[PDB]
Design a protein around this ligand. Structure first.
Ligand SMILES: C[C@H](CCN1CCOC1=O)Nc1ncnc2[nH]cc(Br)c12
Ligand SMILES: [Cl-]
Length: 167
């Protein structure tokens, strides 16, 4: 039993809730919160901008040091950094940005990173300002992640659309 409350159980291991991931993280303090990152860990907007703002820019400061040492991530890749005041750890995962023409097949590779963690609070990768189809992102998540994933979706109309169309 875990502290996640109010989720709709989609499958044996995937759960969904209409909520801001930032608020879910503040309430639950999960072991792992997933950030919808880009390769440079420039947390300007979307989930990343919101998570970083909630850390008072500490996430960005840590991320800039990470990039200075290690260089950019790969599309489809990830790194584990601090969760600051939101979680124990933040798993920064880079889903393809469709608006930049990045290969959508890399979305499966992105979700594979979740399998390295037994339980995660996560957003829909490549959705929102990343430009991909959110129904597709949820499908890839369910068909790729085998560990226990709690998906927080902020937009209510999207959440309703995701539930009503789920197979
Ligand atoms: C990944 C999705 C994208 C779809 N969108 C756009 C606005 O609401 C949505 O659900 N974004 C989020 N998901 C969960 N919590 C969030 N907090 C802040 C945002 Br952005 C966010
Ligand atoms: Cl977004």
């Amino acid at each position: 039993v875990n502290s996640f409350s109010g989720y709709l159980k989609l499958t044996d291991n995937v759960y969904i809730k209409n909520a801001d991931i930032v608020e879910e993280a503040k309430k639950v303090k999960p072991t792992v919160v997933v950030n919808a990152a880009n390769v440079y860990l420039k947390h300007g907007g979307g989930v990343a901008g919101a998570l970083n703002k909630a850390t008072n820019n500490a996430m960005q400061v840590e991320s800039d040091d990470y990039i200075a040492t290690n260089g950019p991530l790969k599309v489809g890749g990830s790194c584990v950094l601090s969760g600051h005041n939101l979680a124990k750890h933040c798993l920064h995962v880079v889903g393809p940005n469709v608006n930049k023409g990045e290969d959508i097949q890399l979305l499966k590779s992105a979700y594979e990173n979740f399998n390295q963690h037994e339980v995660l609070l996560a957003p829909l990768l490549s959705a929102g300002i990343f430009g991909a189809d959110p129904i597709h992102s949820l499908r890839v998540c369910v068909d790729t992640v085998r560990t226990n994933v709690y998906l927080a979706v902020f937009d209510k109309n999207l959440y309703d659309k995701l539930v009503s169309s789920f197979l």
